[PDB]
Amino acid sequence: LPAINALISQDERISSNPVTKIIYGDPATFLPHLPQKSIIHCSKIWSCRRKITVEYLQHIVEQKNGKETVPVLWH
């Protein structure tokens, strides 16, 4: 998934759009009206993260061999 995301982000007909840069894996340093480089203002910190949902718990329990390790939570 990261490899295909990076390759698609480099497609030379949508990368011309500045919107996909601040969206699909390009640090926002290229915006001129920005604060200077800060340890708290890093590109990774200001990125988006996931919302944990019981279906993600289902994925974790099935992908980590939950049949015998933790079956009660699986059921």
Partner 1 sequence: IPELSPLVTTYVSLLDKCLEEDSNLKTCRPFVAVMTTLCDCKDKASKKFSRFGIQPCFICHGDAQDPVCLPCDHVYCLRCIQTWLIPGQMMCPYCLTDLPDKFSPTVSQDHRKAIEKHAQFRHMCNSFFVDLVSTMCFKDNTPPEKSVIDTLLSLLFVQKELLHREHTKSLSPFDDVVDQTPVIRSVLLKLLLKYSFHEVKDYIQNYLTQLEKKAFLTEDKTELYLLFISCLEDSVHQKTSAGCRNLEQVLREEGHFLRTYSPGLQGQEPVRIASVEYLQEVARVRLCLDLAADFLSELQEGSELAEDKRRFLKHVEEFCTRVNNDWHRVYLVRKLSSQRGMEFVQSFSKQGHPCQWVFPRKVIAQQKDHVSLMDRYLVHGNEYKAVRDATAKAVLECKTLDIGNALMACRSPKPQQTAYLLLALYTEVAALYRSPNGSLHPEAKQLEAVNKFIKESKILSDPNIRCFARSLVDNTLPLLKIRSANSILKGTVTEMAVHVATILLCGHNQILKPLRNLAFYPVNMANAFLPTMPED
Residues making contact with partner 1 (CB under 8 A) = 4, 7-8, 11, 13-14, 17-20, 22-24, 28, 30-35, 38-42, 44-49
Length of the chain: 75
- Least Å distance between CB 39 and partner 1? 5
* Closest by CA position to 48, among listed 16, 69, 20, 22: 22
**Nearer to partner 1 (CB atom), residue 38 or residue 65:** 38
**Nearer to partner 1 (CB atom), residue 30 or residue 56:** 30
Would residue 25 be called left, alpha or beta, if left means φ above 0 and alpha means ψ between -120 and 50 degrees? left
